[PDB]
Write a protein that binds this ligand. Structure first.
Ligand code: C52
Length: 284
């Protein structure tokens, strides 16, 4: 893959590094044509990285360039790659952090839908929010899958909350997100990402709970998963959303929905939910 320096290269002295999130928060001067000073996130190699470790982050940068822009994938802004300092990959900064942590903090601030007076539920999460986060991640994953990309670590911890309830796919016990074929055969495909998406759905509709609550992650866990045991419906799910999780958790990878099918399905459930809400709002 190519690296186009004229488009992407950013001077190192235009950054002020801040607190670690290695991924670090930073201030960037003149990275945009939209503003002078902007907060950003920087991924860089620690002191004493090898030639091969340098190649890994470089290949990741090129892949982000090749992938291109989507609202639901953390947006690359620039890079420091030329000699004189460490390799640095610069993206937008999502100040609200990961989705798991956020959902966990909203557990006392949930109603399934809003009615009048709406101020009683100011900044509350609703079913529209949860389905909307799901829909957004599905679209970002359909964008990635279309470009022959496999995420490999799709989990709520790798979903970022931005302004105006926009979520973004990023890449910061992992076994609880892995498909059976990934565990037992070390096979990574787009279909195994769909499995992980299902576990991500469970996380959203449990408001940031840890998958397989109270289950020891040993050889018995893997045995039962391969043999068809699944998580039970989480506390904030709808019946259709739980069925969607089960679909993502199909034993045969080819029998799981595609991200394209998930985008259409979740979009329809978002619309049905909104139509329901408008009726709740009207009659009360
Ligand atoms: C800084 C950076 C650089 C690269 N990537 C990255 C690497 C590989 C893949 C991807 C993906 F999945 F978005 F395509 C993204 C990143 O996800 C990030 C990244 C990581 C954590 C972040 N956390 C916050 N709060 N904001 C932005 C972040 C960016």
């Amino acid at each position: 893959l190519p690296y186009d320096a004229s488009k992407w290269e950013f001077p190192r002295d235009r950054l002020k590094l801040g607190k670690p999130l290695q991924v670090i928060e930073a201030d960037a001067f003149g990275i945009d044509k939209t503003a002078t000073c902007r907060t950003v996130a920087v991924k860089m190699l620690k002191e004493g990285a090898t030639h091969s470790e340098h190649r890994a982050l470089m290949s990741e940068l090129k892949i982000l360039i090749h992938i291109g822009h989507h609202l639901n994938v953390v947006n690359l802004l620039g890079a420091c790659t030329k000699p004189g300092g460490p390799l640095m990959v610069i993206t937008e900064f999502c100040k609200f952090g990961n989705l798991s942590t956020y959902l966990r903090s909203k557990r006392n601030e949930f109603v399934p839908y809003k009615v009048a007076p709406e101020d009683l539920y100011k900044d509350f999460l609703t079913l529209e929010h949860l389905i909307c986060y799901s829909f957004q991640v599905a679209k970002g994953m359909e964008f990635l899958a279309s470009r022959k990309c496999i995420h490999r670590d799709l989990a709520a911890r790798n979903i970022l909350l931005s302004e105006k309830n926009v979520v973004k796919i990023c890449d910061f016990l992992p076994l609880k997100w892995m498909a059976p074929e990934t565990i037992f055969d070390r096979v990574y495909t787009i279909q195994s990402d769909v499995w992980s998406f299902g576990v991500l759905l469970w996380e959203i509709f449990s408001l940031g709970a840890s998958p397989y609550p109270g289950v020891k992650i040993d050889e018995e866990f893997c045995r039962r998963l391969k043999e068809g045991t699944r998580m039970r419906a989480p506390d904030y799910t709808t019946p259709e959303m739980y069925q969607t999780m089960l679909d993502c958790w199909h034993g045969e990878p080819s029998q799981r929905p595609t991200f394209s099918e998930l985008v259409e399905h979740l979009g329809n459930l978002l619309q049905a939910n909104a139509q329901q809400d408008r009726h709740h709002h009207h009659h009360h």
